[PDB]
Design a protein around this ligand. Structure first.
Ligand SMILES: [Zn+2]
Ligand SMILES: [Zn+2]
Ligand SMILES: [Zn+2]
Ligand SMILES: [Zn+2]
Ligand SMILES: [Zn+2]
Ligand SMILES: [Zn+2]
Ligand SMILES: [Zn+2]
Lengths: 413, 413, 142, 413
């Protein structure tokens, strides 16, 4: 069908001020025309923004739609029926909050992607990693510590819906795993390149994978025209990953000046996920997060904010991401705020649009309202270019969310 | 049995003209004499061509004898007996069109090779690959896309007759797989070096195999005094294959001037198979050819004709091939027509003779009628060196087909 | 409830082995021990009652309708497990013979019964068993 | 399509003299009408017998289509393709010799039955058993004797074409075995109830399977509305199989009067196969039959003809059967003339027709030319009721062979 927006301020992410007196025409889930001159509307439904803001749909580069509880190893043991059903409300809340596209960083596979694309369920467009690859005892290894090693999972053949990752060791093993995830429909590859917080037995500073394993993994992803994202916190872990060809680094809280520069020199992106740490600290214990993981939050939580300053100083391209678990999923939009404490509103908005879209290899198709781009559009009760505050919460000040050229929400008419 | 051909025009690939007034002496499946001055054989069965054409047996360098349907995965699950039986006509129809030798590119094994050699059935002399090697998720991986990986074969110990490939990943697996096919009697080795038009999930631009895996495979073939042929469309896929040592490149639809020179320089051969992209476009869908497979075709259809030009200009040795599936196996001869749209009839006929023969390392033993070669001879009602229309069809204008110094078809007498 | 196609080989019933598919309506089990174990797993996993195929089916790859499903020993073993947990067995069955053996082995409800004769119907009624006919599905199928 | 038979002598197997003055109308593969009064059919293709004999197609209840040579354990190991292609001429020769139906008693499965039905190949209709069931070290266990026990078959999941049997031990295992053969499409179930001859390790008088296994096997066959046939030689072995519910007894060479009566009393059948032992005693040793199986030949050969008297004296219903291997399959018809040494021609003919049909559960549908029965008709230049000598050989005196209302051979003109 067709649509026409007018009488509203146009937020173009690479212009520091709203474009005024513009009109947008949507046809068949694509932006058709954008001009400072009124448009010829024969068969288009008209929307009067009445001087409110039209912006591109938002992008979250780091989400886990199947992270339905704080205890991740436990989620993998939950019935597939349940994990699936509890992800529905989740995906839907994401869309309400303005997120028309998301990258899943581990868990959700192709099936979710097609469930959404087909209309079965509603949510952001999904870019799916499949299961994150981790070495034995790595961040994505759900096994507790004892005197024996149970096998990674019950039947290595059938994927558990609740599984966020999978264990693979050695070049052959990791090359096969990547080949399977891709076979199965993954858009990109996730790996753990260091220890983590929400895992049972791995320290935060510990490396993930030999270089051999990382270069093997990277070469597969690329061979299929894709790329690798890597969970890593410390300079050494980040640095080896980047040298090994990883395209985006997840978190990177303990990055330093030397590492930040390497990153920028190599063209890699970093996706900070600051809200999650606040949240793991606020309500982690309270919501059944293992006391092993809680111990590991502090080592990484403090550095969060300054890592951004470091990154901006070096000119590192930062994308937007959140990484929230369980009930904490509701806090997605807070990341905007947290960031505005160091970056200018324009800066954070660019990270959650054009920069993120670059990460996705979707430049000019997402993150900006222009001829040919997907018709993911928002109407906001405010000017994000001045204050990110209107994006906060559960979409209150976002009266209209449109994805693929269809209205999911529209309390304007 | 001993024959002598007389009173006809001799086709010699390395001469632009049908030579005249020549006598040919076949003793024991071998050509004993070809000369202008008549020769006496009191004993021999004399055959008067009637001024018609005596050319060498035709050679097709890319067939799939067991491609009995367009749906290849489904074929692999059919009973070995049916596949075996349904393959007989196919192999017969190939000889009738004058192909006295064919290189099977995956599926047919030494068993067929020896069924033909012994006389159990009539068809071309076979150069077999056994199963094509493919990485997980690659062209020759028949598994569908879901949220689990079933085993490559119900039971890897026993080859399914209708299986065109086998999955192998990583150096030690590719090494073992190659050593296994060779011991089972393969003449050469096939690998999928890219995404396919007739596979279940992979795109076409995708790579197949790391260079480590390709090089290991090549050294294994080489170690047994043979070679690797590789499926590959794009210039990057093609170049890496070549630099890794593969000796013939299958299809190569999207090759460019850059890569062509590289091929030529390393002395690799290329076996286009333009015919099959018509068949698939024309009647593939209708004939139970999977829908997701169908979308692939547009990808390589147009380039086909132009690639021959690029390759010729580069001085790339091109062999003959058709790569047809199911009911389309009957279009085998059209490749002649197609190639003459862009190539000299002489050039074409040489592609399917002295060139193909050099690919099989059978120079002076096949594809040319000369003292000390196989008695692979045809009689054509026409002059291919002037036109190619006589080879078309089911052999209507090919009334004498002789392989191994014996007559499979005769309509002169 | 055996989904496998007909060919010259038997691939496995379970690709998973451990993991149940959400889309699986059934599972293959043969032999008293095998069937005991399967009923015990289904129960521990939370089943309210136990279903068996006691006959061939309309909607299936290979099985004709008139064939029996399971020996009497297998059915009896299944019925005993169901009862040890205070529940019962239901059985898909069409023909008098198939229906009758089932009831004699302790099966509590019969599903379909489309081809039941007047004799076995009394057998059913006497043994206090129930029948669930499912007429509508045959309309829709046709 | 329609035919009309006329001026021929009708052989009806339930009447001692050749009925004269009859006309047979076939249309669409079925016997439409038979009567004295000429038949009024406008387009029937009229066929002129010219006083030759018209009989029902012959039936053999014990063939092995895939017994392409005397070394049966070795056959199991030959490639599927090769076994398959060598069974072809064998099935074809059988149809020349007038056998329009055959019960294959172990080896050939559903695939072969459908290749025939789809006219993929030419040969007798097939009632198949799939693989015969044999206890460990039973007569269908091809494993040589050593100090260790290799797997029954290289690979449990897939079936080998050249495999005539399969090892199964224990009630549960034998119940699963049968259910498998039945799901793959077997028509009936074969078991080895005794030691054998053409096998490595087992003596003749040894029991095969326990009663528990035999009964569960029989109950499995009956549950699907079919039956069991058992290899069995001695009175003890034979007696237990019949008591456990077995319906046909194969061979029965060493049966005594007490057991012959038991068989009759149960209404079961015996299928002698006298011709095979002459063959083994003649050209087994010469055609690559292992010396181990030659030692056992003398154990059943000499009792052959007397067993027919015993059986006849006792009222036993005897089907026709040959059970030949490899080169000796050619001798198939010789069974007629061996049986006729003890039985009247009439009694033999009935064996190969009406009694066989009774075994197949095909009464009035096969073995008799009557309205409704399948159009399986022979033209015999002779009177089998006087001498079966005209049936001997390769159909030399059978100039017409018709199966399912279609002519496979016709030299009448
Ligand atoms: Zn992470
Ligand atoms: Zn994460
Ligand atoms: Zn190919
Ligand atoms: Zn091919
Ligand atoms: Zn049912
Ligand atoms: Zn036998
Ligand atoms: Zn036998």
């Amino acid at each position: 069908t067709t649509f026409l927006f007018r009488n509203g301020a146009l937020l173009d992410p690479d212009h520091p001020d709203l474009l005024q007196g513009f009109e947008i025409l949507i046809e068949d889930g694509f932006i058709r025309e954008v001009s400072d001159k009124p448009i010829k509307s024969s068969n288009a439904h008209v929307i009067d923004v009445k001087g409110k803001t039209i912006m591109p749909g938002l992008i979250d580069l780091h989400v886990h739609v199947v992270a339905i509880e704080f205890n991740l190893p436990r989620v993998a043991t939950l019935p597939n029926v349940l994990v699936t059903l509890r992800a529905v409300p989740i995906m839907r809340a994401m869309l309400r909050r303005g997120f028309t596209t998301v990258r899943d960083a581990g868990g959700a596979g192709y099936p979710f992607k097609q469930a959404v694309e087909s209309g079965l369920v509603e949510g952001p467009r999904l870019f799916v990693s499949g299961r994150a690859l981790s070495q034995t005892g790595g961040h994505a290894d759900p096994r507790a510590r004892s005197d024996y090693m149970p096998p990674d999972s019950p039947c290595g053949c059938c994927v558990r819906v609740g599984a966020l990752g999978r264990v693979a060791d050695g070049v052959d093993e990791v090359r096969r795993a990547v080949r399977e995830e891709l076979q199965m429909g993954a858009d990109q590859i996730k790996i753990m390149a260091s220890g983590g917080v929400a895992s049972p037995t791995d320290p935060v500073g510990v490396f993930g994978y030999s270089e051999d394993e990382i270069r093997a993994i990277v070469a597969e992803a690329q061979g299929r025209g894709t790329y690798v994202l890597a969970h890593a916190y410390t300079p050494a872990a980040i640095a080896r990953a980047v040298r090994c060809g990883v395209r985006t680094i997840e978190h990177g809280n303990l990055i330093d000046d030397e590492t930040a520069r390497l990153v920028a020199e190599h063209g890699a992106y970093v996706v900070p996920t600051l809200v999650t740490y606040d949240a793991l600290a606020s309500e982690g214990e309270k919501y059944g997060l293992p006391p092993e993981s809680i111990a590991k939050i502090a080592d990484v939580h403090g550095a969060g904010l300054h890592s951004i300053e470091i990154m901006k100083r070096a000119g590192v391209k930062m994308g937007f991401g959140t990484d929230l678990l369980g009930e904490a999923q509701r806090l997605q939009s807070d990341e905007f705020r947290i960031l505005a404490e160091v970056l200018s509103p324009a800066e954070v908005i660019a990270s959650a649009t054009i920069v993120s879209a670059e990460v996705l290899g979707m430049q000019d198709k997402l993150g900006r309202i222009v001829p040919g781009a997907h018709a993911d559009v928002l109407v906001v009760d405010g000017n994000p270019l001045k204050s990110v505050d209107c994006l906060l919460g559960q979409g209150e000040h976002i009266p209209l969310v449109m994805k693929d050229g269809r209205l999911f929400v529209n309390e304007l008419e």
